[PDB]
Amino acid sequence: GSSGSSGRNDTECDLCGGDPEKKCHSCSCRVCGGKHEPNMQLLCDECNVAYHIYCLNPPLDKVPEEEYWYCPSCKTD
Ligand SMILES: [Zn+2]
Ligand SMILES: [Zn+2]
Ligand SMILES: [Zn+2]
Residue 23 CA to residue 2 CA, distance in Å, equals 29
CA angle 19–43–26, rounded 5-degree value: 45
**Considering every ligand atom, which ligand is closest to the CA of 30?**
2
- From the CA of 3, how far away is ligand 3's center (Å)? 33
Q: Are strands 50-52 and 41-43 parallel, antiparallel or unpaired?
A: antiparallel
Identify the three-state secondary structure at position 43: strand
C-alpha 66 to ligand 3 mean position (Å): 16
Separation of CA 22 and ligand 1 centre (Å): 8
Q: 1-77: what fold?
A: Herpes Virus-1 (3.30.40)
The experimental method, as deposited, was NMR
Could you tell me the residue ranges of all domains in the chain?
A: 1-77
Do the beta carbons of residue 27 and residue 21 sit within 8 Å? no
Q: What is the DSSP letter of 41?
A: E
Give the distance (Å) from ligand 3 centre to CA of residue 5.
Answer: 30
